[PDB]
Amino acid sequence: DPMRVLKYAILGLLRKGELSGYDITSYFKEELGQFWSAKHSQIYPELKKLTDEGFITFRTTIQGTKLEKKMYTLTDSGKQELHDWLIRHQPIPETVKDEFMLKAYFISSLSRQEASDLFTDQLLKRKAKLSDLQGSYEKLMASMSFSSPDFGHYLVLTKALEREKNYVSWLESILAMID
Amino acid sequence: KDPMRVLKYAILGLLRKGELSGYDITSYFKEELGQFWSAKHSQIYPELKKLTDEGFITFRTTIQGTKLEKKMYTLTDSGKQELHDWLIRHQPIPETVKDEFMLKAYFISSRQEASDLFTDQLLKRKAKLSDLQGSYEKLMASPMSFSSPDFGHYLVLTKALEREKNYVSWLESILAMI
DNA sequence: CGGAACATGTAAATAGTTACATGATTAC
DNA sequence: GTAATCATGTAACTATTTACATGTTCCG
Secondary structure, rough: OOOHHHHHHHHHOOOOOOOOOHHHHOOOOOOOHHHOOOOOHHHHHHHHHHHHOOEEEEEEEOOOOOOEEEEEEEEEEHHHHHHHHHHOOOOOOOOOOOHHHHEEEEEOOOOOOHHHHHHHHHHHHHHEEEEEHHHHHHHHHHHOOOOOHHHHHHHHHHHHHHHEEEEEEEHHHHHHHHO | OOOOOHHHHHHHHHHOOOOOHHHHHHOOOOOHHOOOOOOOHHHHHHHHHHHHHHHOEEEEEEEEEEEEEEEEEEEEEHHHHHHHHHHHHOOOOOOOOOOOOHHHHOOOOHHHHHHHHHHHHHHHHHHHHHHHHHHHHHHHHHHOOOOOHHHHHHHHHHHHHHHHHHHHHHHHHHHHHH
């Protein structure tokens, strides 16, 4: 049984009303993009698939004067299909891929200097990313409970922030042992 | 623009200390390294062929028992440099690290059901943490340092541990809000 | 004996990225 | 002007998983 995560990502994204393929692409680049993403080149054929499967519907609006655009709504099938996925308990994956950690495992092939340089570089990026994430949190807070319509936003953002805090503190631990 | 070919570097790295079979490589992906990279044998064997055709690795045929053949792969000079350049290269950090649970979490708007789904995730992640702590204790029993031949193993284990601790702690925080 | 682990491949499919293509609207 | 962004789609390729397919060795 093929997983088809993207199908559920699209269906989930449409849960509060119509969106274009472009809007979908745009959401994968905002806060959700820390945990799932797809290129437009994957999304458009899939939108066609989901329509043929009868989970979604589209109408054709016009931006400006002659630019066509396709708004998508969930169907009865779509909402249910979505829901049957949402509450389904899934096994946690063994692997969550990280190319840096793969490098970490092969550390013996590096001299103290080379490893220090590698790990230092990673930290500076990870801290830069941490800044961007910390800033976003604040921009969200001025704008928190389960009732909140931004609770989904809050979840992905706090997770992403924690994830980078953890990565920074970990790297600093190894650098203390390296240097 | 140029294929990452991460699987090529996972293999060359796995051979950095000497010869291995495709079977051996498959196994390493099922042990502590599997927390951060895995491949199936069906991907590994064709890739081993490809790397041999590319001159990064070589192989001999050894015989287990009486008549079972085994190809043991070794790095070439060209492969060691290939490994080296990749290790010291500064790659940009990925925007997305995929997590299907966190996708689900984004769609919470669709109270009891959210509690159950998170409680289950808490329990499963508590379990994975217990297994990881156990493995960390097995490693430590056998004076850790950069010089230590098990530094890599230590790194992947600590990271995996930090990862679950932080996941478990997060899920608790969110559950108390709900 | 029998089952787990060892050992190696290929086929068919899904999943994902990069490159190829085009054109319209917004704001400076 | 012109650049960035909005907007949609197809082609080729790279990556990964599940299933198919075979046979040996170790150990109790």
